[PDB]
Design a protein around this ligand. Structure first.
Ligand code: NMN
Ligand code: NMN
Lengths: 479, 463, 479, 482
């Protein structure tokens, strides 16, 4: 089902230069593209197809890794680069894109790199062009909704023209190689699944932490907040991958179908539940990176009711996971850039050792998705009569230094060209994720909850550290 | 106080025990097959003191102290008058014990407050261990007896129960289900020097499987005690050995393979064959391998693959628990071996724990998407650069000083070992089975290589 | 939510509108479940006004005697209508309040179903106000089934469609999930570890007599395994729904349907068996063979037998033995989960049979759940003491004497007047059912498997007992 | 060979043992050569007291087993000499009474532990002791562990442990014997027999009667010493034991002793929380008005007749699983039974629906009937508007119905035959006894320092209100049919 005609919308955007064109050339330069591939890039600004190509070369030079860069391999990729100045608002403009496009039976992959308000106009023009017709796919990587209603608004109006199979919603997460091995680690190994239940598993937690701020995306970040921005998709995907029941086989939908279910089955957070289970944290002026950094209001310059931090004790309510607290924690201006997963297991049924002897420490498996990728499992070992909880450590980066550090889109981009792709979100996953997330905002918006701030680099609001510790567990911290 | 190390003037107590004993610092009495002087025993100790940890010997004023305080005394072990030339260890052998035990006690008196450590196989047939034990227990106290397994005291052997029972993840699969087979391997690069004749009567099997490994097996297969009591531990090991599937005269043909180290190379030098070194024809098995079966609710149908040898290509000690594979491969044929997870701990050669894991390879939606096996390492001897890599024997003497057997073999344990062992012997001897020569530095007879492979399993090689 | 006062009946002339549907409806109105204000169209044209006489003939001799009463019948007789029309002719179909919902029940054949849609749309009956139910044997091939389904879908929304399987209404079939997931003892055992094989048997003493002509089309495997027995497999293997939802439960069956090991053309010689009932004894009486009863020589199976495999985490490697049969020794539908034997016999072989535990759900004619345990016989023996297998028996027929509900159909039917539809199948379910069964038929046709004769009343072809025998498994029978 | 019944005048001998022996004679499991010599403390001195034994046969033995002709064959194997354990000098009369040493002598002390030691001293003078001689004892085996040990120590000093065959009446009943067959002869249970899958265990011996003619012996001990140190504690070991490798006497025991060694100490502190005591009180029993225990005693009474405990085995398998023991006299019904409540379903797929989904339960009634059954949830049949109904149900097995044919025989006949056989299979070991004794001695001390008072319950009532609350605080209840 590979597509030899693809159209790049929003080609004027930073993402297309920053994450799209470099990924493409990276696929080119290695030969994953059928050389009979058309790529009709479209932007409002005016450039000659040879012209646009020169702009792309700048982007390729300013973004593609130097080792990949080759003046021959760039040129071979540019001769598959064709552009066409078009207004969306005017559907009559699209026909010029249509003439460039390769025959429909070969098919068209339609990337949308714009704003969700701009989505509605563009789809209409394609049908007159004929690009709207089946044999056309469609990817989306935008603020395509903040609540259900918009997402339903945006999706319902799309599903009018295409179908779910045509739609390829994309999550930057799942591009990540580390995110992907997680299914392999759980289902390529038979030790984890026996204990991957409510019994022998005590608490689990997610922490996507970053020192960076909302530098540049502020004003636009102020609309999402950490919870709309990172946890809505990115983090709930981690939960799905870690809690999903296995599919019978590695199918796009069957994999999705289990994640969809995990999204569907979770403890809802209600009005009364939110004060107990939710924590907010804005950023105080603080020194981060050894350099003093300004508060959120400092940079924002305006009153703001957005988070930057979130931390939620979620519950998966399925036979397997019912009653296992899932402790989420994301935020900016944190002590380290370290996204990580810690599964903590229930302690041994009986400590047959002396009370004096080191208290047993529950076995825990830790995976850090970013920046370093490592997998470690806690154990107890008698010391050369005492013990130390010592770790069985492994670094993926050490394991495969040679493998190329491809970009997260290079991979995502091809799945879309190749055929049905499991790394792309579905409406069923999308509606459920809002279901949980939305209420949370409405319930705590209805509760006049206002974020408790911390000085930047403080590890977040004190109110947080107690959400976990009033149940008796601590957030994993390096020592 | 005053001890007696009968056979301290020997290899047993020149590197393994007495050289290690330097750390164990009372007047020290030591018997001697080569009966030298008081100062000379210290001088002989001083050469062994030279063969000790460089830092600990250099730091110790003990080497000066050893010259300062020393005891030597014609052992006269055979003589009823073997004594007078508090606790004595029998660094002697089973033969150098029975008469030795009878006479050493009589000259200085005996009864309680006297040591009783076999420090030996202390038996050939059951009757040997039986008779020899029986005459001891009727003359000592059961608490006084300290049968010694050089291994059990080794710290790496010890953390197993902490490993096994301090960790939730290992036990759910530790079953008949969830384990495909277990694998124990005692390797040495060395041949036999000066011990071949004693070894030749004993056999490799008797020297290591009966004492060094069977305990290891218990530690690996035993059901836990309610609490970590000396007898609570031992009572559950006894349960293991007594649940060992007997090797009949029929089970020996298919389930065992004998070997013998031939002539070859070891490292950068080349060594000669075994019998030629002996100078007399030997039918002793330098190398033996067993397909032991333990039958219990937990394990019935889990093969235990034994392997200890001499002049082996490399010396390594470790256990390979290979787990029963995933009930289903949720992936396509094209990507991933999906090789079974295994837990491996190096023991005597180095202390490390590693678990086999399978991780998806960095990949793009190419036609092939393989997942590679990866291991989680812990260097038990690299994280504890603070803890002294102190010898294993040194600690056991502390337990003797306590007078509580924290780790000494029990008769009800021991008698379980021979009954199984001797059934291999009486049996395969009744079938006229003979040892197979193997090149020095190779991996025993090729008859073994087929023992592992008729099941669909292979031994463990790092490469 | 039906707002429905109108019922549509097709195929009344069949031995189904009389034996099951007409008595079923008798209950729906004789206990206040049918509105007082609340049609009969014949696949075979019949003289009219016969039905008021016909129901008394057909019902009296079909409905339960205790249930039967002179009064209840008159109201039912009045409500009933009878127009003599032909499915082949659309104009006939046109010859019914709009406000009342029209619910269309199709008790004809799959081929006749398309015509009914053809006349309804044109007669004025098909309406958003119309809900249509369809018989279980719809289609002989996935493409034929997909053909009819696609046509109905344009005419009717999926919700209006109510795909019928009578097995899903049988009480013993319904509580199967309650048995499995309302009880924690069963689930730990329900895995590749702890289950040796599952064993299903729908047994029948009666060969088709009137229906042989229509049967010869659909093999015993098509008539029963496609719908009835294949649902049983879902209930006995389906992973738990997080919550019981009509679609999620159907969704999880679909997952089970899709995880069956493909019976190709190479796995048909080894994992399937066909049979045709020869001549023998039925009730001390001599009854004739298939080919005698039906003159045309035929390769049709009056008996089938499968060794199906579910290849997921839970079930990979657990054999599934399915044996629908005609002219068999008994009418006993019965699932027999046989569990893995003790990991070790800590008991001497001489005194121990140590037979494996078996969960036997008897679905008909008697409701009788039971479990088998081995218990020591009471005697004084110094050695080799004997141990005897014993059964813990239950009787849903004896325990629920008070509940007193006669038939599955009345619940399913009433449900269509209610519009619930949880029992009714879903399209995605249907199509995964066919593709698996279609392969088994194609492989035998490509592999030229021909039914073996079995004297009528002998469990089946000798070949079945050997399909189990090679694997050590036997066919459970009361001994 | 030759049997001796020390304690011959005992009511227990009259009902439990003399009927059992008749059954062995009737079935011809008893040698014609074998002769039984009985010494009774206070009555029926004449050898023709067989009539007194025959009286015992009538009021106790089953009619079908009873056979007028068969009695005489048995009674003319009965030889009685009046003897006093306290005076050794009269032990001789038991000797000079058949008892050829080569045939050998099987000695039964239906006497109390206090009388145990004295009887042994007479036998050694009589030449009864040492070779060719066995020895049986009884359930109490001493007031305390030191008390049992002092009597114990001298037994092994006199006969080799091979020859002591201590009797725990429960171990040997067929329903008690099957337990291990239940546990390890099937694969269904053990997946869940752990601290994951189980809510709690419940062992309960109930009795409609009080103590009559047993009161003087009874007020020395108490119900826990009477039917717990030996009986109910054996049952606990069988329920919680890790399986043996293969079914050998010591292989079974060595794990049972561990279950006893595993149990957590009640201690002085836990008794307010884990111990409930009762004193049988005047009321109804059997439909009859029966007298209160103190009034029957004729003296103040500190002994329970009822106890209820929250036992804890602290091993890998059972750590933290409460075991609710409850043995009583004048309880509403006679019925020994075990109820395993399995930990409830992990999550409910039909949580919205009304039905409770009660936790599964394995019920084994050892007495008075023999029965195993299983709690399962199954959907209630209904036509449902919206919402669903689920009713719990029982999978039935009446062992007696399954094997009615095989003769039903007294546990003692199995227990006694092994004695002549010289078999220790249903006979307790000293290590078994000490572990049971230390636990009991510690609860008794805890009761002593806290001065707990048996709390009076009515006759025919479910014990004291104190016991119901101890079960209630967990949420657990007591199984009561209906
Ligand atoms: N007893 C029955 O007649 C019965 C049973 C199961 C399915 N069906 C199917 O429903 C329809 C019934 O038509 P007849 O009543 O003419 O057989 C057909 O599609 C038939 O194959 C009938
Ligand atoms: N039913 C019983 O009498 C019974 C039950 C268990 C043990 N015992 C023991 O047997 C002897 C009974 O003697 P009495 O018949 O005088 O009660 C005592 O040692 C007693 O502890 C009696």
């Amino acid at each position: 089902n590979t597509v030899s005609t693809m159209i790049l919308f929003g080609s004027t955007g930073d993402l297309s230069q920053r994450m799209l064109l470099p990924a493409l050339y990276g696929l080119d330069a290695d030969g994953l593209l059928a050389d009979d591939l058309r790529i009709v890039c479209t932007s409002r600004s005016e450039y000659d197809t040879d012209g646009f190509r020169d702009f792309a070369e700048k982007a390729l030079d300013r973004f593609v890794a130097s080792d990949r860069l080759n003046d021959d391999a760039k040129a071979k990729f540019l001769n598959k680069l064709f552009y066409a100045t078009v207004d969306i608002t005017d559907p009559t403009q699209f026909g010029k894109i249509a003439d460039l496009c390769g025959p429909v039976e070969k098919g068209i992959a339609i990337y949308l790199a714009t704003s969700s308000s701009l989505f509605e106009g563009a789809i209409a023009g394609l049908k007159q062009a004929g690009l709207a017709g089946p044999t056309s796919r469609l990817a989306l990587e935008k603020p395509l909704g903040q609540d259900l209603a918009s997402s339903d608004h945006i999706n319902d109006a799309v599903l009018k023209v295409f179908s779910e199979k045509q739609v390829y919603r994309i999550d930057h997460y799942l591009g990540k190689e580390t995110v992907q091995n997680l299914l392999t680690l759980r289902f390529g190994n038979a030790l984890f699944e026996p204990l991957w239940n409510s019994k022998g598993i005590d608490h689990v937690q997610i922490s996507v932490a970053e020192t960076v701020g909302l530098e540049g995306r502020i004003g636009y970040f102020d609309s999402s907040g950490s919870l709309r921005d990172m946890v809505q998709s990115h983090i709930l995907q981690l939960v799905a991958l870690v809690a999903m029941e296995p599919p019978a086989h590695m199918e796009a939908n069957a994999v999705r179908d289990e994640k969809v279910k995990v999204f569907r089955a979770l403890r809802p957070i209600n009005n009364d539940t939110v004060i107990t289970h939710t924590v907010t944290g804005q950023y105080g002026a603080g020194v981060s990176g050894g350099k003093e950094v300004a508060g959120y209001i400092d940079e924002l310059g305006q009153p703001s009711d957005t988070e930057t931090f979130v931390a939620i004790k979620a519950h998966v309510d399925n036979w397997r996971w019912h009653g296992v607290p899932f402790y989420i924690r994301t935020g900016k201006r944190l002590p380290a850039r370290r996204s990580e997963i810690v599964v903590q297991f229930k302690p041994v049924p009986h400590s047959i050792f002396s009370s004096s002897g080191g208290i047993l420490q529950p076995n825990k498996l830790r995976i850090v998705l970013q920046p370093d990728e490592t997998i470690q499992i806690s154990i107890m070992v008698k010391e050369p009569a005492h013990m130390r909880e010592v770790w069985l450590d492994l670094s993926l980066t050490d394991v495969f230094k040679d493998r190329k550090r491809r970009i997260a889109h290079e991979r995502l981009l091809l799945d879309l060209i190749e055929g049905d792709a499991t790394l792309f979100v579905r409406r069923d996953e999308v509606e459920a994720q809002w279901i949980w997330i939305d209420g949370i905002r409405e319930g705590w918006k209805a509760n006049s909850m206002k974020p408790k701030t911390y000085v930047s680099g403080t590890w977040g609001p004190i109110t947080a550290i107690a959400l976990v510790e009033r149940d008796g567990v601590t957030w994993y911290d390096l020592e």
